[PDB]
Design a binder for this molecule. Structure first.
Ligand SMILES: O=C(O)CNC(=O)C(=O)O
Ligand SMILES: [Fe+2]
Ligand code: NI
Ligand SMILES: [Zn+2]
Ligand SMILES: [Zn+2]
Lengths: 14, 432
């Protein structure tokens, strides 16, 4: 199913 | 103004599994709707509890290997890939200059065998993860990837270290998001000179400016044997410098052609994503080994996955530059269409673009005043960037973009002046 991938390099974002 | 999702109406939490409802287009936590990760795969089109009663149940699909599984890693190790030697450039540290990159617009991966000449400052190969703890902080929280689950988790650096040197590892954990720019470890590391020379933030981000400076140039990678990171395009379409201090890393590189970018976007929004190797869908997937003391440079837009064949400690970072501005913008649009949470996007991407635009303007004018012309890639990039500027400032779109526009920037004048300069160069380029 359409799922958000989280195993990636984060930037802290916002 | 923070968005919320699911039946629980909570802001995004990267530590929880989420699926999208086709009907709603809203996202739902697996645990909130009773869908376990292991069974999510069997669902093609998910219908949330509400949409279900109003428009029928979810659409089921129809053994498959699960990406990140121990079986997946073994099969990957035995897969035949294309030899990266036929495409990657191997300049020496002293040959890797801005001029060298401009020759082909830094369009293919670059692997430097020895740090000599890279102007890189790093601790010795005897640095340990334990030393990272001492310099970063045992109590600092970090994002850790549970490779078997291909999901992000959060724990104390100190806890991760305990797991690392632990005489047992029932779980495959991988740390790839520890940016230490604001810790003391930052004093022991200087990014490659070529990175600092090309970096938009490094050179064009002013002091204060009302926006926090994006810090994504110094990351510490601590990966245990068999860790695996699936195919992706780094945030903001940034380029990547990757130095293996101890151990080894294997990269699977795919060129960002229009076909592969389309294939990538379809794969990133599929219901099968975790059951298929994206590498099998492209014509060329290059396998590149990066060993101790070697430094890999990944260009804008290049799709890649990463396997850690042995425990590994490495340093790396991300940076935006002007050699392929259109590709950076393309990556940016893909992130938007995929509903990418902010923690996986380049922070203040649009703001730095505005500063770059202003800068590129001065360069064009500066070159014209000194009876000289810009390289072709700059013209192409200046143009794609000016197009984005126009798109972000259109009456109907401005509300979603005005906030990132620097106060010291006159959008209309910038856009008009840039269009003038670009057009001039295009006329001169037409003479020949
Ligand atoms: O080290 C890893 O497992 C994954 N790393 C990357 O994708 C990177 O640094 O760009
Ligand atoms: Fe990456
Ligand atoms: Ni940058
Ligand atoms: Zn929920
Ligand atoms: Zn719904």
């Amino acid at each position: 199913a359409r799922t958000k991938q989280t195993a990636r390099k984060s930037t802290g974002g916002k | 103004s923070v968005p919320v999702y699911c039946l629980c109406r909570l802001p995004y939490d990267v530590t929880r599994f989420m699926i999208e409802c086709d009907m709603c287009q809203d996202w739902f936590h697996g645990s909130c709707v009773g869908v376990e990760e292991e069974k999510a795969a069997d669902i093609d089109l998910y219908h949330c509890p509400n949409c279900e009663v109003l428009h029928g149940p979810s659409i089921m699909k129809k053994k498959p290997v699960k990406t990140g599984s121990p079986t997946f890693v073994r099969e990957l190790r035995s897969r035949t890939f294309d030899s990266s030697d036929e495409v990657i450039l191997k300049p020496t540290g002293n040959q890797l200059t801005v001029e060298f990159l401009e020759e082909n617009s830094f369009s293919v991966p670059i692997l430097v065998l020895k740090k000599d000449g890279l102007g890189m400052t790093l601790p010795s190969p005897s640095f340990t993860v334990r030393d990272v703890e001492h310099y970063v902080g045992s109590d600092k929280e970090i994002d850790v990837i549970d490779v078997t689950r291909q999901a992000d988790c959060k724990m104390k650096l100190g806890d991760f270290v305990k797991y690392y040197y632990s005489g047992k590892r029932e779980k495959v954990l991988n740390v790839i998001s520890l940016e230490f720019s604001d810790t003391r470890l930052s004093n022991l590391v200087e990014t490659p000179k070529i990175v600092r020379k090309l970096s938009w933030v490094e050179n064009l981000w002013p002091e204060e400016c009302v926006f926090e400076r994006p810090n994504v140039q110094k990351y510490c990678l601590m990966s245990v044997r068999d860790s695996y990171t699936d195919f992706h395009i780094d945030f903001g379409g940034t380029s990547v410098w990757y130095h293996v201090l101890k151990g080894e890393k294997i990269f699977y590189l795919i060129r960002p052609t229009n076909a592969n970018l389309t294939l990538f976007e379809c794969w990133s929004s599929s219901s099968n994503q975790n059951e298929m190797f994206f590498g099998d869908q492209v014509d060329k997937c290059y396998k590149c080994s990066v060993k101790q003391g070697q430094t890999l440079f990944i260009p804008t837009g290049w799709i890649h996955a990463v396997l850690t064949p042995v425990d590994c400690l490495a340093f790396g970072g991300n940076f935006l530059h002007s050699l392929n501005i259109e590709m950076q913008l393309k990556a940016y649009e893909i992130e938007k269409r995929l509903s990418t949470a902010d923690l996986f996007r380049f922070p203040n991407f649009e703001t730095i673009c505005w500063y770059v635009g202003k800068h590129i303007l001065d360069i064009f004018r500066g070159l014209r005043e000194n009876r000289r012309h810009p390289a072709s890639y700059l013209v192409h990039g200046g143009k794609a960037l000016n197009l984005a500027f126009r798109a972000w400032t259109r009456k109907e779109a401005l509300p979603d973009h005005e906030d990132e526009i620097p106060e010291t920037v006159r959008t209309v004048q910038l856009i008009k002046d840039l269009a003038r300069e670009i057009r001039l160069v295009e006329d001169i380029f037409q003479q020949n």
